[PDB]
Scaffold this active site. Structure first.
Site, PDB file in Angstrom:
ATOM      1  CD  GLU A 195      -7.531   6.744  11.191  1.00  0.00           C
ATOM      2  OE1 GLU A 195      -8.205   5.997  11.924  1.00  0.00           O
ATOM      3  OE2 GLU A 195      -6.627   7.474  11.637  1.00  0.00           O
ATOM      4  CD  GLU A 206     -12.545   2.312  17.455  1.00  0.00           C
ATOM      5  OE1 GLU A 206     -13.134   3.404  17.291  1.00  0.00           O
ATOM      6  OE2 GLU A 206     -11.831   2.065  18.443  1.00  0.00           O
TER       7      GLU A 206
HETATM    8  C1  LIG Z   1     -11.154  -0.315  11.300  1.00  0.00           C
HETATM    9  C2  LIG Z   1     -10.304   0.065  12.471  1.00  0.00           C
HETATM   10  O1  LIG Z   1     -10.378  -0.585  13.524  1.00  0.00           O
HETATM   11  N1  LIG Z   1      -9.470   1.090  12.287  1.00  0.00           N
HETATM   12  C3  LIG Z   1      -8.659   1.582  13.384  1.00  0.00           C
HETATM   13  C4  LIG Z   1      -8.953   3.073  13.559  1.00  0.00           C
HETATM   14  O2  LIG Z   1     -10.280   3.214  14.055  1.00  0.00           O
HETATM   15  C5  LIG Z   1      -7.900   3.718  14.452  1.00  0.00           C
HETATM   16  O3  LIG Z   1      -8.212   5.094  14.540  1.00  0.00           O
HETATM   17  C6  LIG Z   1      -6.503   3.520  13.835  1.00  0.00           C
HETATM   18  C7  LIG Z   1      -5.398   4.051  14.749  1.00  0.00           C
HETATM   19  O4  LIG Z   1      -4.095   3.890  14.213  1.00  0.00           O
HETATM   20  O5  LIG Z   1      -6.164   2.163  13.513  1.00  0.00           O
HETATM   21  C8  LIG Z   1      -7.168   1.160  13.322  1.00  0.00           C
HETATM   22  O6  LIG Z   1      -6.849   0.419  12.161  1.00  0.00           O
END
Ligand SMILES: CC(=O)N[C@@H]1[C@@H](O)[C@H](O)[C@@H](CO)O[C@@H]1O
Ligand SMILES: CC(=O)N[C@@H]1[C@@H](O)[C@H](O)[C@@H](CO)O[C@@H]1O
Ligand SMILES: CC(=O)N[C@@H]1[C@@H](O)[C@H](O)[C@@H](CO)O[C@H]1O
Length: 243
Positions: free
Chosen positions: A67, A89
């Site tokens: 994540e 995110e």
């Molecule tokens: C820091 C970021 O953007 N993480 C995102 C996460 O929010 C998302 O839920 C995930 C899905 O596979 O992959 C990504 O890496």
């Protein structure tokens, strides 16, 4: 607590690059915060045999590492050494606001992913804040501001059933038994079902998927370090997403 299963040195080996100056979240995710947060969820990593406890820790760190990953295929130490690089995110496409009588979206706020599990949506921030006794629905940024609260949101998510989804905890410890709908859909005990709980609507039941593979890579690396088998049913490529 869990410090007996996962030492500071082991955590640091796993999350080798969280303090890399190249990572936006440098300095935020600490072993001390992880351990402190886990105290609020005492059955995490203390349920079942030592083998099961190690697998639970590897599973939790694996998923949360995906994540928050800063990995790329040719990264130093491999892509599965770059967990816990991000806090927020990257490039969210919406404010993650859904209708909810109990947990309505607070005007002006956004529920994009924050912290180790990238907690998303008003309907997760709401009950999580209630459990943690902090106003996460009104101040979702808190998840990206205090390191102990950050880890607590991830553990909350991991430990909390949300019907028809079991808790990730109950799956990995062997407490969860699949329903007839689950066995028909191929939602069988293992890491794949955990991916499904976390982000299955977007990632599961659509065949091979690089995000699902990345989750598995971290889990394999961490199980290797902890000295345990991963178990089977690692992917959710053929699992219908949970309701
Ligand atoms: C820091 C970021 O953007 N993480 C995102 C996460 O929010 C998302 O839920 C995930 C899905 O596979 O992959 C990504 O890496
Ligand atoms: C993704 C990953 O790091 N996998 C490793 C693998 O390379 C290694 O051979 C094994 C035993 O050490 O542990 C893990 O399965
Ligand atoms: C960690 C987290 O918040 N995961 C949520 C999940 O609970 C929800 O079912 C799904 C809907 O697509 O969105 C994910 O972001």
């Amino acid at each position: 607590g869990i410090e007996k299963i996962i030492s500071r040195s082991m955590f640091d080996q796993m999350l080798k690059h969280r303090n890399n100056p190249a990572c936006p979240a440098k300095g935020f995710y600490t072993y001390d915060a992880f351990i402190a947060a886990a105290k609020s969820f005492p059955s995490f990593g203390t349920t079942g045999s030592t083998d099961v406890r190690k697998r639970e820790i590897a599973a939790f760190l694996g998923q949360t590492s995906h994540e928050t990953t800063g990995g790329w295929p040719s990264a130093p130490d491999g892509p599965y050494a770059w967990g816990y690089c991000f806090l927020k995110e990257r490039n969210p496409s919406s404010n993650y606001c859904a209708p909810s009588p109990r947990y309505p979206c607070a005007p002006g706020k956004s529920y994009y992913g924050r912290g180790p599990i990238q907690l998303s949506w008003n309907y997760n921030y709401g009950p999580c804040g209630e459990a943690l006794r902090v106003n996460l629905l009104g101040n979702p940024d808190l998840v990206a501001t205090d390191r102990v609260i950050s880890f607590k949101t991830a553990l909350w998510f991991w430990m909390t059933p949300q019907a028809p989804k079991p808790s990730c905890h109950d799956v990995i410890t062997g407490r969860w038994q699949p329903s007839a709908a689950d066995t028909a859909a191929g939602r069988l005990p293992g890491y794949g079902v955990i991916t499904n709980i976390i982000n299955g609507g977007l990632e599961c039941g659509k065949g091979p998927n690089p995000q699902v593979a990345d989750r598995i890579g971290f889990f394999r690396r961490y199980c290797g370090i902890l000295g345990v088998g991963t178990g089977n049913n690692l992917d959710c490529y053929n699992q219908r997403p949970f309701g």
